Design a protein around this ligand. Sequence first.
Ligand SMILES: C[C@H](O)[C@@H](O)[C@@H](O)[C@H](O)C(=O)O
Ligand SMILES: C[C@H](O)[C@@H](O)[C@@H](O)[C@H](O)C(=O)O
Ligand SMILES: [Mg+2]
Ligand SMILES: [Mg+2]
Lengths: 434, 434
Amino acid sequence: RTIIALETHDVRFPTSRELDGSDAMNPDPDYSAAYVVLRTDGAEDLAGYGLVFTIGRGNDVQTAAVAALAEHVVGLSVDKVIADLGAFARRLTNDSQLRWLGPEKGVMHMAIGAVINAAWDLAARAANKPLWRFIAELTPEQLVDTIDFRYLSDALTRDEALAILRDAQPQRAARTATLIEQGYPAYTTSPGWLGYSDEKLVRLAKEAVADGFRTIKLAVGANVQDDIRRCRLARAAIGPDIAMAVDANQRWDVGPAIDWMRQLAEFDIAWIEEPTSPDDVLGHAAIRQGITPVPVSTGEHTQNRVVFKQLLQAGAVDLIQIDAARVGGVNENLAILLLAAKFGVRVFPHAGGVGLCELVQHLAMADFVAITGKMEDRAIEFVDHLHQHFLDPVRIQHGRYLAPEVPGFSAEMHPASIAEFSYPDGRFWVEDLA
Amino acid sequence: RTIIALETHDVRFPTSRELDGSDAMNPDPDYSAAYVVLRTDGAEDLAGYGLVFTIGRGNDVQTAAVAALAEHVVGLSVDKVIADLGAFARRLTNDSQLRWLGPEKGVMHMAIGAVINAAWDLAARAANKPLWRFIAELTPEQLVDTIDFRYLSDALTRDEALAILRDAQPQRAARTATLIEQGYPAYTTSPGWLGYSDEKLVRLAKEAVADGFRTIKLAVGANVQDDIRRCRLARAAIGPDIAMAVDANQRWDVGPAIDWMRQLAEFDIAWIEEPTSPDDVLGHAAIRQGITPVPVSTGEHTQNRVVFKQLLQAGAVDLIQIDAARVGGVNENLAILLLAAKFGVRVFPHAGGVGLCELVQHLAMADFVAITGKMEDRAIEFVDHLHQHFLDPVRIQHGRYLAPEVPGFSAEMHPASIAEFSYPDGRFWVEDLA
Ligand SMILES: C[C@H](O)[C@@H](O)[C@@H](O)[C@H](O)C(=O)O
Ligand SMILES: C[C@H](O)[C@@H](O)[C@@H](O)[C@H](O)C(=O)O
Ligand SMILES: [Mg+2]
Ligand SMILES: [Mg+2]
């Protein structure tokens, strides 16, 4: 079989109508997907799906970036692609001309990451396995062959990665059983969007705990008085035993972040996410040093494994987020997970976007099985939005993610959803723009 | 007057035909420009020009990113835009949805930077001044009003920037006279492209020195034996008194970079440019610590002022490059120049791309007049390619840049050049692709 087309769609959801996903930096996001399909001349089931998550404006540019990769993939042998995902990723990441648009950052890199992710979806489907098992069941050699070790020789060599993966082999099967029977811890951010009223915040926080979530997260960062008020209300609503994280979405400078967190510390903060710019490694370390022991995290916007390496080297974080679509696809996230494991830093996957819960759950689960063997000390983010648009929506049971069973990356979306929300000619948008 | 249109063009030059611009990372670049025009309903002279520099593939995506900004600018009052370039820049950089595609990095940020640069071109033209004088003659208050101080409070506050600018006021006029009469030091990289034969390297290096350049730069990084051979040949060709820099274009890891430079040190290296990833602040510092006193530089791919801040804080560089199109336009480069001045780090502007000499010369000259008052200790890069396509090509006299005189950013390109090299329907490409 051959990849005969790279199809792209600019799909946007009107989440801003109710301010779902709203925060201090992004006050009215419209969760969007630069959706891509790697089509083949095989069975209808033999296709790869992926998407870049954006929040509205710019999604057309992001979609255009993905479409520009068609000549790089159309015509390739399916067997050749899935048999060497490392070579496939490099075919895109090593194109020096595309690197100039980055390198390995921004629109062009996320576009590359979406095509790479679609290829892993295609591979998992061909293997008749949900992506987490596809990844976790590859041999240590097959796994490191997909990783780009450039710029990491000082922190993680191929031999060091192999050692970590080989050390985990004996328990892979047992952990797979544990995951399937117990699920993976989750936490929810849906009760904390900044655009919600105090009444809605409290109502949703209570429902979240009622649903079994042992941790919730609130957006903060626009007004300290508002944050103090909201954190007090949420803490009172959930009780003293539920963890409560806060997310500043990059709003603060180093000094202000320290002073701001000093005023929220009394409410028992699980961690402060993105207190400052996602590029400020030294800044996060300075903030962490100033507010310790209040935990600091960052990661959903971290451009690539080189920046993650530095965050770990500089001791800028207590835990990190990883994102399925921000970096160079699965290949890059595997490098990041191995770096986090080697440095002994917990990973709390980011999923605050359409389709992100569906995608990222697989990376966290593969990590548990083949890399760390640790999940009760961490959690996968969850947001209660737009799951109805995916063929294999995530399943949460008593605050825990159930392991996916169907083949693939869970990225495939309902054609009806694409038809209704494609921008700007989709049914909803033609009516809305009118 | 009003901005009535944002016109964009995908222009690509076949520099790969002779491997002009070739290096270890980018072996066959096709110097390209994602050209933009801010058109108004005023005089034909009243327009803003700008461009994002890329090396071929991907330029269509970059052009699309710029075109996507039309709704943000079309309809704006020319007087309102030029009277507050800080507000104009923020209108684009503070669009949270566009920030998600970055933030402040990659394709979307460079697109924003090109539109911002076009606005400064428009402003300088309205003022009937070449951009360097337009910038250097603004009051300290007007200058800081254009700067985004977010994420810089720990290294450069508004008051600190004002102090530096005010300290320079007394000598602004005298330095303007000095620049106009003496020119600004330059160095050339055109003799050192990696794709050239040893014979061509030597021939061009000799011509470069004959033309008055006191410094040349060679691309290195693919094969150490080749680098040793080429550096020996170039050094012998130029003599012991001419400075010779080398550029690895991000090829090495930390350890290898140190070992590689140890083998080139005997040829008297002026500086090693981009020894590793443009995102590795800690890595550049480690390399610098290992090869000192051999100077280390980086900057042409540095995504924004936040990364530059860290490079300075971490002592990762001996000198930095700045680039007119890589960051958020003039506004961001002013912040970077002020950071470099405050930290006492020399700036050697990057210009290895089409139109970059034309653009960046203005930033270096404005810096000399209004910020540092230092130029004999540094130099502006020059490449001997494609200047014929610009209405106001740079002028080099005895190895020094002559100060531009015509109004603007020198970005305007000949319509005939655009017609011939527009991709893929331009005259040259239709014939070439055939
Ligand atoms: C705009 C988005 O909803 C963000 O606020 C979201 O990704 C957030 O950072 C999160 O961690 O869930
Ligand atoms: C592809 C380009 O010619 C680069 O090699 C060029 O920008 C180089 O880095 C330089 O500093 O001139
Ligand atoms: Mg977050
Ligand atoms: Mg360079």
